[PDB]
Amino acid sequence: KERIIQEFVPGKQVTLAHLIAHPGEELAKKIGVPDAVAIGIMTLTPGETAMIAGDLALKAADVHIGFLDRFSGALVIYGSVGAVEEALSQTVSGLGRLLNYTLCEMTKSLE
Amino acid sequence: KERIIQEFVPGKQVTLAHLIAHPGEELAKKIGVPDAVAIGIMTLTPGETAMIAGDLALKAADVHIGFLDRFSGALVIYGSVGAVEEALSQTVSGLGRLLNYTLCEMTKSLE
Amino acid sequence: KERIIQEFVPGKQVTLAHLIAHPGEELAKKIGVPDAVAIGIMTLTPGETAMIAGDLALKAADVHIGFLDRFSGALVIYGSVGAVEEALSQTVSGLGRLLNYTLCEMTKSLE
Amino acid sequence: KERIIQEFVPGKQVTLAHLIAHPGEELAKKIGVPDAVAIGIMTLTPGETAMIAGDLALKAADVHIGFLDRFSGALVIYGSVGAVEEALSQTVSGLGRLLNYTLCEMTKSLE
Amino acid sequence: KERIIQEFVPGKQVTLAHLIAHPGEELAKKIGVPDAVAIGIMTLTPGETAMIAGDLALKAADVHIGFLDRFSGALVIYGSVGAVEEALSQTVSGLGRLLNYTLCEMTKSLE
Amino acid sequence: KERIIQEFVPGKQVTLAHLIAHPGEELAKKIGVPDAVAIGIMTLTPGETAMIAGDLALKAADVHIGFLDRFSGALVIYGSVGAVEEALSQTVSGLGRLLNYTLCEMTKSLE
């Protein structure tokens, strides 16, 4: 085979930014967020980006932090479908702009 | 040898989607799911995909979340063999469709 | 040096499948399994494979789950040397068959 | 495919150094820092660099450690916008100077 | 830059096998082993190899398990300098033999 | 893109060895070491190297273990600036000598 030594470092990337309107009570309960709200999901690298994204999203629309995970880089917000959608949209563009992140497409699940 | 610096980032992939009808009480107990039900197993990357897959599966058939792990990316559902099988099938195609994931084949264990 | 971006994803592999007859009480105590039994050890990737392997092994011979680790991908079974050996043999082939895993040789420690 | 063996080792890098004036009480509460203060965010590799950066930042301006994470390599400081900004600026240059780290640009979020 | 997708899997390797005679009470306390004994240190990949090595070492000489870590792949034994040395020597060769591991040199610290 | 399978294994490396005289009470408190002492910081791979380095440093000068982390590979010592400096110096050379590690430069923060 081949042996390579590899100095690892975090990349800067928004891997997914997903909207889920009408998650349902079971999923909501599992996730640890309020029922009857839309939901925004982001994975971020490095993990500390979640605090930055948290700031952005809060300032972008009327959304709330379900939870913020500075280790995994997870961030979950909730609120109206419209608020969550804007918050997501704004936060992705803000990261590529302020920090020149690798970005992704915003995605959605409905029904 | 050779030294490479490596900025790591999560891939987007469904690595496995497996059905297990008749798991048995011992395995069920270990896994932390009800007995007398079929079982669906998925590994997902990044870990946060488990919440998205959770949504999809719940909406695809009459299945329930045994547990959802947004860290490892694990998701276990249960229900009838038919319900679990459809939920699995739907969830994989839904991820490749909505999010353009790398997908896998659905698999099964019976007896 | 060189900078590479690396999207990571789990491989599908059975890295080891080892039989240990006569482990002794000290090792058994450390491992958290009954004394006076043979022992089967498997490392699996991804971690969720341990539930699938758990199913296979239980169905292959008269063995029992010492523990199943869906995070590390560890699975430890115990029983007679013959039962453990068959369970191991069957589970490896089953994974390569059902899921086309990268497989390994079965190994053993005696005395 | 291809098989490579990879001996992993930590790189030496400041991946981000971000200033957030006016984070808001919600974000502040989530993050575990005082309200009404600016905030500095750094990700560092290896994780132990957070203690070194902690030293630098404290000595650079009138800032305080919200928290220091020698595992993830996270470090959060707070104080006036001016103090936090200087602390950040100084700490980045200090690491590249003393330890020849790979550095980044300082960034900021306002409003 | 360059983007590579990387399916990760554990290698099979004994990275170090080190003997420490006369560790001293402070170090011993930190490590969580008895004082007045020599000490053997191994790092193993995958993590589950520690249980196999544990078996080998116990059978090779009159040594005892300080602790066995099936997650990190750590294994610490203790006993006489001679017993620990033989246990180490035997365990390394046993792994390369039974499992065709990548091996290392045995090392020692004295005084 | 490109798919590579990657068997991972720990490298053997001292990534940093840093001296901090006059850390201050705040930083000291955060770090979990006594005030009014100099401080030595090392990151080591693999994680188990921290026990070996712990032995070396203790034997090299009149220093004490603030803490030893066999998981992350962290080791923090304290004592006089001179004792800590020698302990660090000795431990790095000892590792390259006994174990042929990849080494680093010793570094320091003063004032």
The domain locations on chain F are 1-111
Among the partner residues C7, C47, C68, nearest to B72 by beta-carbon distance = C47
Pick from A1, A7, A58: CB nearest D27: A58
Side chain identity at residue A54, one-letter code: G
Out of D52, D54, D59, the one facing F30 most closely (by C-beta) is D54
Q: Which residues of B touch A66 (CB under 8 A)?
A: none
Coil, helix or strand at residue C86? helix
Q: Is E40 on the interface with F (CB under 8 A)?
A: no
Contact predicate A66/A32, CB 8 Å: yes
Alpha-carbon dihedral C99, B100, C9, E71, rounded to 10 degrees: -80
CB distance C69 to C27 below 8 Å: no
What Rg, from alpha-carbon coordinates, does chain D have? 15
Question: Interior CA angle at E62 toward E61 and E66, to 5°?
Answer: 105
Residue F77, token pair as written in the block: 């010592």
Return the number of other C-beta atoms located less than 10 Å from residue E49's C-beta. Answer: 27
Residues of D in contact with A70 (CB under 8 A): 31, 72, 74
B24: three-class secondary structure by DSSP: coil
Q: Are A17 and A96 in contact (CB under 8 A)?
A: no
D42 contacts on A by Cβ (under 8 Å): 48
CA angle E103, E104, E109 (to 5 degrees): 150
**Interface probe, candidates B20, B43, B106, chain C, greatest C C-beta count within 10 A:** B43
Peptide bond connecting E23 to the previous residue in cis, omega within 30 degrees of 0: no
Flag whether residue B102 sits within 8 Å of chain A, measured between CB atoms. Answer: no
Among C5, C54, C67, whose Cβ lies nearest the Cβ of B9?
A: C5
Residues on chain C touching B10 (C-beta within 8 angstroms): 7-8
Q: In whole angstroms, what is the distance from residue A90 CA to residue A23 CA?
A: 22
Q: Which of E1, E72, E105, E108 to mutate to test the interface with F (most CBs of F within 10 A)?
A: E72
The reply to whether omega before F23 is within 30° of 0 (cis) is: no
The residue among F13, F70, F97, F100 with the most chain E CBs within 10 A of its CB, best to mutate, is: F70
* Closest Cβ–Cβ partner in C6, C15, C45 for E6: C6
Q: CA of B52 to nearest chain A CA: how many angstroms apart? A: 8
User: Which residues of chain B make contact with A23, given a CB cutoff of 8 A?
Assistant: 55
Contact flag A5-D6 (C-beta cutoff 8 Å): yes
Q: Residue B87 has which token pair?
A: 């939920």
Instruction: Say if E30 is an interface residue toward chain C (CB within 8 Å).
Output: no
**A80: helix, strand or coil:** coil
Q: CB count, 10 Å around CB of A1?
A: 9
Q: Does the CB of D5 have a partner CB in chain E at under 8 Å?
A: yes
Q: For B30, which of C5, C9, C65 is closest by C-beta distance? A: C65
Query: Looking at beta carbons, which residues of chain D come within 8 Å of A79?
Result: none
| A51 SS3 class | helix
The Cα of C61 is separated from the nearest Cα of chain E by a number of Å equal to 22
Helices assigned H by DSSP within D1-111: 25-31, 49-60, 81-98
Task: Return the CATH number of the domain spanning residue range C1-111.
Answer: 3.30.70.1710
Alpha carbon C53 to its chain's center: 7
Which residues are within 8 A (CB) of F10 and not within 5 positions of it... i.e. 6 or more apart? D7, D8, E15, E43, E45, F45, F46, F47
The H or E element containing residue C18 is strand C13-20
Distance CA F12, CA F104 (A): 12
Q: Which residues touch F83 (CB under 8 Å, ≥6 apart)?
A: F38, F61, F62, F63
Residue tagged 């132990």 (tokens): D48
Contacts of C68 in chain B (CB under 8 A): 27, 30-31
Contact at CB, C3 and B8, closer than 8 angstroms: no
D3 touches chain A (CB under 8 A): yes
Pairing of strands B106-109, B74-79: unpaired
Q: Report which of E67, E57, E66 is spatially closest to residue E91, judged by C-alpha positions.
A: E57
The reply to whether C74 touches chain B by the CB within 8 Å rule is: no
DSSP A68: E
Strands (E), F1-111: 3-10, 13-20, 38-45, 64-69, 74-79, 106-109
Method: X-ray
Partners for C (CB, 8 Å, 3+ pairs)? B, E
The identity of residue B58, as a single letter, is L
Q: Are F51 and E41 a contacting pair at CB < 8 A?
A: yes
Q: Is there a cis peptide before residue B46, judged by omega within 30 degrees of 0?
A: yes
Bridge partners of F69, per DSSP, are: F74
| Distance from C-alpha of A76 to C-alpha of A86, rounded to nearest angstrom | 14
The reply to whether residue A20 touches residue B46, judged by beta carbons under 8 angstroms, is no
Annotate B27-75 with DSSP letters as a single string: HHHHHT--SSSEEEEEEEESTTHHHHHHHHHHHHSS-EEEEEETTTTEE
Q: Judge whether C27 and C111 are in contact, CB under 8 Å.
A: no
The reply to whether D110 touches chain F by the CB within 8 Å rule is no
Quick one: tokens of A78? Answer: 């909730």
